[PDB]
Amino acid sequence: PSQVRQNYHQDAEAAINRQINLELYASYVYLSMSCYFDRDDVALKNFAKYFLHQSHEEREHAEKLMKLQNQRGGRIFLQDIKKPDRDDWESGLNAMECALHLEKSVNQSLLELHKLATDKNDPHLCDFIETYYLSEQVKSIKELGDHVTNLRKMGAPEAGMAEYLFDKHTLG
Amino acid sequence: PSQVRQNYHQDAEAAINRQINLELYASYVYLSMSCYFDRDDVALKNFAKYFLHQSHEEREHAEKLMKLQNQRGGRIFLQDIKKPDRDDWESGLNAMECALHLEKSVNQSLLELHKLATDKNDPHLCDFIETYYLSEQVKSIKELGDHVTNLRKMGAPEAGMAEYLFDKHTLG
Amino acid sequence: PSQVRQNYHQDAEAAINRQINLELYASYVYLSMSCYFDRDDVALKNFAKYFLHQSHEEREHAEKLMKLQNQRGGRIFLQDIKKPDRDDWESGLNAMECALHLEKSVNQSLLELHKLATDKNDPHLCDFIETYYLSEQVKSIKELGDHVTNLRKMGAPEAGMAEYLFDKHTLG
Amino acid sequence: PSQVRQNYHQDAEAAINRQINLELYASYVYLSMSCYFDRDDVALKNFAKYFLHQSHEEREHAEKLMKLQNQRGGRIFLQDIKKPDRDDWESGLNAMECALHLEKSVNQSLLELHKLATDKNDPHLCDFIETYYLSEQVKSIKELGDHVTNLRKMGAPEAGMAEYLFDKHTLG
Ligand SMILES: [Fe+3]
Ligand SMILES: [Zn+2]
Ligand SMILES: [Zn+2]
Ligand SMILES: [Zn+2]
Ligand SMILES: [Zn+2]
């Protein structure tokens, strides 16, 4: 074993590697969304900015898990980052709904990771997940839900001014 | 009697205790409204902020009446703060209309208190009510009426963009 | 269910609503204590200030739980805020002892909430309680115990100068 | 009549002259108290300072009434300022109790003046009394009551350290 390794189960190590991949995947999905809003036939700059920010944040989440893996004496094993499910995200509202779904899926994975850490009596890992991941996920999910609610109420995407004005007022 | 008490009728003391309860109740109603607008399926942050501010102001109004009670040598007797009449405030417009109704009810109570103070020849209490309560109430009522008027004209709540844009432009 | 809701048991939602009420109740108790010390026949300004501060802090605790409820997709249901058990708090020492009792009761409720969150495998809620509530409660309880100890040792309330000097030196 | 006089009853003019004398008398009483605490066999400097401040404030109250008299076109008629009832004020507590009595007597006179102004339909005079006199009196009375309460509780004057420590902590 690594000279630093202590109370770090092989199953936790494997789950952290899976979580790294999932965060990198989420980063890629958000990058895809960002570049959709930069298309000349979509042209919502603040939607593009919002999703690019989310992409960079997910990369940071992945890098922090890589740091944790090494700190605990685990070994990072990278896998392919799969392409996102869509090229065309159809609308600001649809992208926000897809983002909400993604964030909930990431949250579910983190909750499973916390359950594993609890089962293996790894309080450092539990604390790490709680401190750096779980509260962030809840905040992100609430924000996306709020955005979805507002866009729906405004009449997006059928009401032509809705996404435009949301881009200016909420995301600007 | 309290060593400080002078020209302070028992009926005024009792009416001040009732007014304290009413201000605390109003504070609670506004708190309820504020947290409705923070729901993920409502998500109007500036409505939430507006009503939270009103909640805190009503608490301050109650505390100032408690200070008056002690200053005059009366004794504060607290009562239960009843829960607001609604959990779900339905819309920004409806909340503003309910707030207007509440503020007018508080104003009516203050006018009755001023009448009592006048009848008991208590000019200090009359002046206190006039100086710190009556002008504030008139200002609040006018503001809420203005908000109701604008929301109605904009087409709230049926017009989906109305509350959103009012939240941004008037309450932002 | 709310679009944001994930891993949030109905029993936790209900327990959070109960905790909101308890924090609002504690706020009201402290407000009662504060206004007792402002009486002309008590006249301990720093006791009054201390308890008013505690009242405002408890309100903030309640508001933070309301924010949590909405963040997790629960629904706030408010109840009556019952009046405190006493109008007359008798002495600085007695008020501090009653405050200690209250803070321990709030702590017990929070520990029961944490146990529920643990049983329902809700690490976000566990973390929230730990991070924002449990350490604060322990600190508050220790502080009140220290105050009680000092007031008792000084001879309060029989020793007339004790509460006066404690008001100046400890609470001033 | 004076070219400026309007809605200013001769009875109000006379009552203002009486009030001027009473404020000057109160100023003199407080001056007497102040110089008692400066005696080498009393030697409570902050009691002396407190009462000297009150003396100067009462003079200002008198001067403001003189200004009002002239503003309304009344004519100031001064009378003798009677000496205070005591040369020796016996103790800090006794002086505070005598001050409380004096302030309540001044307040009673002001309430009678307000009643007269009300009866003569002189809203400017009513407002003047309310704005500049009544709230000040209530504040002064509450403060003196608080001081009396604290001195009594501390054991003044029999408890030798009470007035000394009150002089340092409350009046210092
Ligand atoms: Fe001392
Ligand atoms: Zn992430
Ligand atoms: Zn109010
Ligand atoms: Zn609390
Ligand atoms: Zn005066």
Structure in words:
This is part of a larger assembly, with four copies of chain A (about 170 residues). The first copy, chain A, has about 170 residues and is mainly α. Chain A has a single domain, classed as Ferritin, core subunit, four-helix bundle (Ferritin, Up-down Bundle). Helices cover about 75% and strands about 0% of the residues of chain A. The first copy, chain A, has five helices and no strands. The first copy, chain A, has helices at about 10-35, 45-70, 90-120, 125-155, 160-170. The termini of chain A are far apart. Chains B and C meet through helix 1 and helix 2 of B and helix 1 and helix 2 of C. The structure holds fe (iii) ion and zinc ion (ZN) (4 copies). One zinc ion binds near residues 23, 26 and 58 of chain B.
